[PDB]
Structure formats: C-alpha cells, structure tokens
Amino acid sequence: DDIEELATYINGQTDMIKASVDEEGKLQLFTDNNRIDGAATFGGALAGELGIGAAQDVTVDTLDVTTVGGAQESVAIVDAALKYVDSHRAELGAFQNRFNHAINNLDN
Amino acid sequence: MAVNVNTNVSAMTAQRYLTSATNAQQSSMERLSSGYKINSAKDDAAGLQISNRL
Amino acid sequence: INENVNASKSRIKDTDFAKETTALTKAQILSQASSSVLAQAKQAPNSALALLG
Amino acid sequence: RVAIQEEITALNDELNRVAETTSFGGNKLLNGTFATKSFQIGADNGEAVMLNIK
Amino acid sequence: RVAIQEEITALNDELNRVAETTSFGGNKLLNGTFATKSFQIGADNGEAVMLNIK
C-alpha cells in the first residue's frame, strides 16, 4: 500500500481515529476532543518508521485552509464539532420532551 | 396554551419556510435562463475564481 | 502572393459556418429557455394573490 | 542533413514549449513542477487518490 | 503487458478503496468491520433478523 491508501485503511478500520496525507506523505492523525480525551500513544514498527508527532490542540477558530494539508485536517475538526453540536442539541430535545410530559402531568 | 389572536406562531413558521422556499426558487429560474449555475460570487466563491481563470 | 493573401483574408474576416451555426443554434436554446422562464416568472405575483382571495 | 537538422531542432523547441505551455489555468501539467497531487474523491477525509505527472 | 499491469493495479486500488469508502453514515459496509447486525423488525423484543456483510 502506498502512503495515501494507507490513510484510507486506517479510517475504515476504526472511527476513533481520522487520518490523512498533507503534501508529502505526512499523516495528520486526528482525535476528537469530546470522546478521546488524553494524549494518544503510538507504537509498532510502522509508527517508528513514520513520525509519532506531538499532540497539537486545534479548534474551529484556528481552523485554516490555505493548503491541502489543512484542508484534510479541517473536515476532521468540523466532523467532531458537528457531533458535539448535534449531541448537545439532543440534550435540549430531551429537556423539551421531559417538559412536555411535565406540562400535561401538572395539569392532571 | 393560548388560543389568542395577537400572535400566530403557526403563521410565522409558515412565513419562514415560505421565505426559504422562494429564496431558493428565486435562486433558480435564473440558472436556467442564464445557463450557468455560477453567476454571482455568493453561489460559490471558490468556483468563481477557477471558472474565470478557465 | 494573391493566393496567400486571400487565404490570409479568411478566418480574419471570413467566418467559418461551423462554429457560427453552432453558436446560432445554441443562442436559440437560451432564447427559448429564458422566454419559457418568463412564463413561470409572471405567475409569481399570481401566487401572491392566491393566499387571500 | 543540415536541412533535416534544422527541422529537428525546430521540432525540439516544440517539445520544450509544449512542456511549458500546457497549463490548465496557471498550473503546469508537463513541466515537472506538478508534484504528487492528491484528489479527494471521498465523502470523509483521507480517502483520496494521488496522481503524479512526470 | 506492462501497460495492462498498470491498468490492473490501478483498478486493484479501486477495489480496495471502494471496500473502505462505502460507509452509510460512519459505518463500514464492505470493509469487513461490519459484523452480524440484528435488525428489530417486530413489535416485541428479541425476534430480530440477523444480517452479515462479508
């Protein structure tokens, strides 16, 4: 497998990790903050062959896309943001339904 | 709740979706006449630059 | 010289019927398409009055 | 053979020029400056395909 | 035959890619990571129907 198809393989194997290639073969590993808190430790012969890299914190505010590398990173950040927003939307939704059953209960 | 006359929430909701329905419909009826789906930068800012260069 | 300058006096002044006919045919489609758009665009005020008789 | 060499070196300039003129909007397809360019053809990230033009 | 081989290895990457791209909203249908999933298709519980995608 070449460098780019290896990134697709990792994405398919697990949804816990998002991987991509920027401009020369460097993998941009991603970690969703709302569920994978803590640093990620890398191991295996392939990890040593590549670069382990440091844990850099990125959000939508610092999300910039001027080169293809940041573009593959950005969709990963947005996907985590959308999941967090949707999950919090559900929290308000359950709050509304708990209250709809509260209103008709109080009337009883 | 409130069977009132001063506020019509249902009418307001129909108002908003009517606005969104004919805003996209107004966006159409001009891509067909012009023959282009890119005629203002608001449709696709990135598409405009590359299309003009091409 | 006369032969070659006459060739030069073509594609500079003299039109090829290939791209001109396709341009004319294409322009007819836009003219017919937009004219049909007026048909669906004139009825937009009609739908406005439809809400209240 | 001198006359043929004149035609040969003339067509040689064509080979070099065509490698410098094929652009596609300010790019350079056959110059060799077109490095490995990855085309994102997937819904999610990472599912791209790289293409190299020598 | 070398040229044909470049075509076979090109389509070979397509077979692997499509197996790892077909997702249906974050799942993986053809990667083999989709084990036996039971679909509840009845009023009460337990009488689901299993489905496996190899």
All partners of chain A with 3 or more CB pairs under 8 angstroms: D, E
Q: Give residues with Cβ within 8 angstroms of D27, minimum separation 6.
A: D34
Query: How far E41 CA lies from chain D's nearest CA (Å)?
Result: 30
- Cβ neighbours around A7 below 10 Å, total: 25
Q: Three-class SS of residue C52?
A: coil
Residue numbers in D near E20 (CB within 8 A): 47
Residue showing tokens 């008709």: A104
CA C33 to chain centre: 10
Tokens of E2: 């070398």
Separation of alpha carbons D38 and D46, rounded Å:
10
Method: cryo-EM
SS3 at position D32: coil
Shortest alpha-carbon distance between residue C29 and chain B (Å) = 10
**Residue of chain D with shortest Cα separation from B50:** D25
Q: What is the DSSP string of chain B?
A: ----SS--HHHHHHHHHHHHHHHHHHHSSSHHHHS-S-SSTTT-HHHHHHHHH-
**Contact (CB<8Å) A68/D38:** yes
Q: Show the tokens assigned to E48.
A: 């689901």
What residue in D sits closest to B53 (Cα-Cα)? D25
User: Are the C-beta atoms of D45 and A6 separated by less than 8 Å?
Assistant: no
Which of E31, E34, E53 to probe by mutation at the A interface, max A CB count within 10 Å? E31
Q: Do E20 and A11 lie within an 8 Å CB cutoff?
A: yes
In the 3-class helix/strand/coil scheme, how is chain A assigned residue by residue? CCHHHHHHHHHHHCCCCECCECCCCCECCECCCCCCCCCCCCCCHHHHHCCCCCCCCCCCCCCCCCCHHHHHHHHHHHHHHHHHHHHHHHHHHHHHHHHHHHHHHHHC
Furthest C-alpha separation in chain B:
60
Q: Write the single-letter amino acid at B10.
A: S
Task: Please report all neighbours of E, defined by 3+ CB atom pairs within 8 A.
Answer: A, D
- Separation CA A46–CA D6 (nearest Å): 56
Contacts of D40 in chain E (CB under 8 A): none
Strands E37-39 and D48-51: unpaired
